[PDB]
Structure formats: structure tokens, C-alpha cells
Amino acid sequence: NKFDLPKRYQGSTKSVWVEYIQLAAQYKPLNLGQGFPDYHAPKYALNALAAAANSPDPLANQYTRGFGHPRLVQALSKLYSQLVDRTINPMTEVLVTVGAYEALYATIQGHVDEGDEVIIIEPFFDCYEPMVKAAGGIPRFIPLKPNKTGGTISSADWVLDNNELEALFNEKTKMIIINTPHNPLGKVMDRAELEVVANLCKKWNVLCVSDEVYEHMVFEPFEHIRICTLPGMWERTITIGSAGKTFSLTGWKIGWAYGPEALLKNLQMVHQNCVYTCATPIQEAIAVGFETELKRLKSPECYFNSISGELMAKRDYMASFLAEVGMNPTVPQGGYFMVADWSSLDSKVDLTQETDARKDYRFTKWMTKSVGLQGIPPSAFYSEPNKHLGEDFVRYCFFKKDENLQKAAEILRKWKGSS
């Protein structure tokens, strides 16, 4: 009856996101932090939500099926069945969730017990660690590190030490979480890299959880490969996606996990007594969205195909202006984020009035308040022992109107050499 946090949440603090969203509302900077477009998503999707709101069907805005709206799961199985080349059962092998967030939540709560080890690759999407810890698991970390220095490098250059990775696998290893395309780097794992992970999972009987929200956003000449597609991997993989990312409608918060029925049963049990069901007219609108794209999967007008081309130009413009101004950027193989090492610009920043412990927090806060440009501190994506690996970096989002990417460039040009 002390109403302290229960032990499993012991020492929990507010996430980066709660802190930096609040920082954005307060200073109103050019917001290149959290990932979302600053322009309209596909009209066919927005139209479908207005249509569901306006539907003459009285069931359109009432409860739908708890493991997912029938029309959506059917659309999801149609698409992914083609992509993974097996027939995925829409009732048993798909679970619709509240964003990729709740799919990750239901997966971790579903398969992580007290003392189970979970391997996490740093830098990691930040929720992975607190979710494992809340489920009583023991995270085991391995960092990706660049094998090139100075100038602009590629996210391909950020690599695991495979001996170090092998070393982490033992009889206590329950799960490994991989994220490709990767947040924050943009790294897309190639077939050899997936093979390394898959071979260890098979040897050690571990569950692979593949966070693939950015699956449609890989840039030529690279290619998204699905690990559940590797030999023997289907039986031991759960794969996650997000309609917020697939359709660029981040405020809709609908995602999914797919995989064999045996593994999904555990997620269903968590899901059913966490939220139970997800928004009907939103899932309906997403279902129409998938139906729309399913008719044209190899067309240049298909949003799955067009987004990379849309994004690649903006990636190239930001990499250029970040290099121009003095940072060392990592050019992502997919996605809409880019990390840059800003440390060579340490003389143009006074971080003296900044209060927190981590340098990249001080840098990003200072830039927000002082110059009106918001990025995200990458040390948020590292375990405490390795936070130093992130401190010289900044993550920016380039999913923006060209006019706003130019605005960021000009802020940076003015800040630099206007000494």
C-alpha cells in the first residue's frame, strides 16, 4: 500500500518520446525528431476513413473481432502470403494490434518469462528494453559499429561482431529481436546477416522477433528480405508491421504480428486482456488501403513502391547538407531517419546551460531551444553501459516537404560560420 511502482517497473522514467514531444510543443521548432510526414498521406486511405465514419452500416463504428477486423486480416494474409510464399491463415496466424508498439508488447509479454534472456541489437528502437524488463527478462546487448570513419558512410558499414553475437547465445536465450530496416541507422540486413541470426536461432532453439515496420522503404539498389522466409525460420519467427508506417498515417496506430499459430496463441492471450480489440473504422480504412494496393503490386503508383523513390531524393539532400555543415552522416539503406556524427562541430555549440547527463541530449535540446531545429538523441537507443556510443550523434527525420528540408539546411548553414 505504498503505491510505488511494482518491482517489474522499478526505476522506470518517462521515455524520450514523452520528453521530446513535450519539448516540441513548448518551443515549436522545425520538428525533424519523431518519425511522421508533414504532408498528406495517400488520399485513398483518408477517404476510406471518412467513408467508414459516414457508413450507413450501424456495425461500422461498433466493436469488431478482437484478434482483428475480418476485412483487414483477410487483406493482410493475401499480401503477406504472396510476400512470404506460403498460405497464412488470417484467423490464427495474424493478430492486429495498437501499432507495432502493442504487437511488440504482446510478443514480449507473451514469450518472455522470469529469467529468460533476450538479445537486443544496439542501437535499438527504445521500447525493446523496458518491455523485456517488464516481462522479467534479461536483456543481452550487442552493438552495431561502423567499419569506416569520417565523411559519409553507409548504414551497411554498421556491423555486428559475429563472434560476440555467437557468444550471447546460450541455453537461457529465449528470444532475439531484430529490426530491419533499422531504426535509427537505416541498415537493411543482407541475406548473409540474416543467415547468421537464423543459424543461431535454429542451433539454440530461439524465437526471432523481426520488427519490419519499414519494410516498404528500402532504397535502390538494396532489398528488404524477410527472415521468416529463410530455411526453417517460419516455425520460429514472429514478424511485425505497422499501418502507420506502411501508409504514412502514424496517428492511426494499427499494426500486426504474423507467424505460426503456435507462437501467436501467446500474443492473443496477452492482447485479449490488455486492449481486447482495436478501432473498427480505422481497421476498415486500412483494409480498403490494402485492397487498393493489392490490385497494383508492381505498378510505380503502388504506395509500397513509390515511397522509396519519394524518400530517396530527400535522403540524398539531407546527407548533402549535413556533410556540408560539418557532420558525418550515415546514409541509410532504407527508412526515413539518418544518424550523423556532429562531434566535429563541438566548438559551435555551447551546451553549458544544458542540464542532462548525456551529451547528445544536451546537443538536441540546445538546438531545439536556440536555433529551432529538433532532432533525437541516439543514446536513447543504447543500454546504459553503452550510452557513450550514441553521445556524438543525432538522428533526423527526412520525411518532410522539400521546403522544410531546405528550411533545416538554412538553419544549419546560418548556425555554422555565423559565429
Place this chain on the structure above:
Amino acid sequence: NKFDLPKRYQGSTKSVWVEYIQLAAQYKPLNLGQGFPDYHAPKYALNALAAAANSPDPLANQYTRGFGHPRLVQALSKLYSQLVDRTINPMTEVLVTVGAYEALYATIQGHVDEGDEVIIIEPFFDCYEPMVKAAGGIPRFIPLKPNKTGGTISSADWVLDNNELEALFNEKTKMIIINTPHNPLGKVMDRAELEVVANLCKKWNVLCVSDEVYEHMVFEPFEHIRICTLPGMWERTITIGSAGKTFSLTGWKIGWAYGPEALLKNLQMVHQNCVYTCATPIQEAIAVGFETELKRLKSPECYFNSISGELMAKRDYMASFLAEVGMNPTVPQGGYFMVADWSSLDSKVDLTQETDARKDYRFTKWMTKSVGLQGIPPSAFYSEPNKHLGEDFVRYCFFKKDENLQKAAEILRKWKGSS
């Protein structure tokens, strides 16, 4: 690497809800089961969702603030500040969630540690027990029991044994969950009943969680009273609502917890790493719905004021045809569910084809597949040892078009022998 359920979820089965929704899609009965309307909700709310989908603001459909969309938390604080007669800080004292479901989830995960005792009042909304058990908590049950037999009783007649209740409270008691107006019975707790609980919560330093989802649906001459409003109770209460119940848009799945900052901090830590944030356009629409009602709170055509008379005509009709066919109905003080005793018609049913443990599951099951009319087996809402109090009963929803209520009666008559 047995990927069996974790120890937290060991007992776990599919909920009444995953089972009955599936039942319902399969046999396509007159669905008097899950609580939702048969017809459309107020048009102003539906219109506001269409407007958010169609918005010129590109951020209308992108991520919003994780603890609650600002327009919505503002409208909630404006409403509840007036209802509870205090100033509720919209930023720190309101949390928006994926339905009342995730409000209960974050509350129980946030405040129940291993070994904590949680007292639950039977019959109970079904998620309470599995949530407590998932949090490592120990559920402690007490049934409401009718103090009258024969005919049509009132939900006021279902009452707790005061000494049973007092004995349940010990220094291991962390929490009590109360639900008023109550599901499935429709009981509205009077002031003395809320005083009993209040005085025990203060004595034993326990957190009261008040599930008030049906807050606006109390029938004359009864009154919804909020326990957080009793002396000394604000500091020890979390109260929960649902937009899905407030605006009869059950597929929108947005609810909230409000109470003191100290207590909501715990739910914030769970929420930030469970779903993170909720749907933007749905929260925007609900905020517009609240602003609309806030301009006319004292007027009869305010939906918070009008829904009671709308539902009361239906309540009275159902109560009357249930009694005519020879059921013993409990007339609810509030809400849109009615529980009735179907024992005195056991003769006239064949449960000999149904396979489940509980007599009332076999019944709901019979009537659905065989006579085209589904409700909910009230055993679902009892602890294993007490399920027997739920086995003579059946719960129906009367939030249905007048003509379907007239049809549902007919089905009952055609099966009983009232033609």
C-alpha cells in the same frame, strides 16, 4: 524454448469475448450479447471523425501526445472538473487509453505487485480477474446476492455482505475494484454503499479503482455518485470512463483514467511502453463530441442527459417480455444490460448437445445456434468456486432498435410456447 505461456499467464484460456464474438459471426443470431447499439450513434460524433479524416491539417492523422491528444484531455478536464467539483489538471491528472480496457490494464499493471491482494465484486466485468493475476496479484472475491426472491426484483436488491466485505480487507489489500453502474446487474451504488467502501479504503490504505463506464446511463429516480468525490477519496481513487460507452461508439476504443498525479504516474509508465499513444483522429472527434455537449450540459437534449430516457423505454419493455415468458428479471438502475433467472424453464431446453463445463454457457450456446438469439452466460463473471451463482442466469442487452426488441420477444415466445 518451450514457448509455452509464461508463468504469469499459466491458467489462460480464450476470454468469453473471443469465444462469443466468434459464435456470433458463425451462427449470425439476434445479437443481444456484447453491449453495443443496433442503430447509429449521435451524428455530430460521426461527422467529427469524417472531418478529421478529411482535415487540411497534415498532422490530423499523425502521432499525437502519448498521454492524450491535447484537445481531448482539455475537454475531459473541463467536464470532470465540473462533475467532481475540483480543478483537474488535463496534463497530469487525465490519461487517455485504448478503451476503458487499457485504462484498467495500465491501472492494474501500474499498481499491482507480486502478492498484492485485490478485491473483486462478483459478478465482475470479466477482465478484472485475469488482469490482476497477470500482474502477479491475488484476487479476493465477494458476491453481490439478491435479498429477495420471486418475480421482478431491482438491481438495488443485489447487495454485499458487509461483514464478509470488512473481513476481506487486511494489510495485504492493495486495491479494490468497484463498477458502478454495474455490469451485468445494472446496480447503482447508493451513497451508503460507497461510504462502506470509502471508509475501508481509508482504514486499510487501499487504492479504489472505480469503473464508471456507464456513468451517464442511470435511470430516474436513481443518481450516479462518483466515489472520488467522497471525503478523503480523491487521493486514493482512479476513475475510469469510456468514449465508446459515453457516445455509443463502441468501435472507437478510447477511454480514460482520471485522478491525482501521484497515482496516474504509475499508469503512465505502463502506458508509455505498452501502446505509447492512441489514435489521433478518433481522439479529435471525441474531443469535438465533448465540446458539443459541454455547451449544453444542462439541457435535456445533451446526450449525457437524453440517453437514460432513450434506454429506459427499452429496459421496461425487455423487463416486461422476460417476465411474461416466465423469467425472473432484475430491473437495472442504470446501464443497458439485464440479468434474468431462466431456471424455471429448464424443462424447455436441450443442453445435451453442448460440451462446456458451465450450465449457462451451454444455454447461451443452445439459444444462439438453435433459436437465433445470443446473450452472455453470467458464470463468465464469477470466480471458479462461485460460478454456481451465475449458472441460473442469463444477461441480455436492450440497447437495440424497438423492432428488434419486438422480434427478440417473439423468438422467446416461439421457444417457450408464447407462440
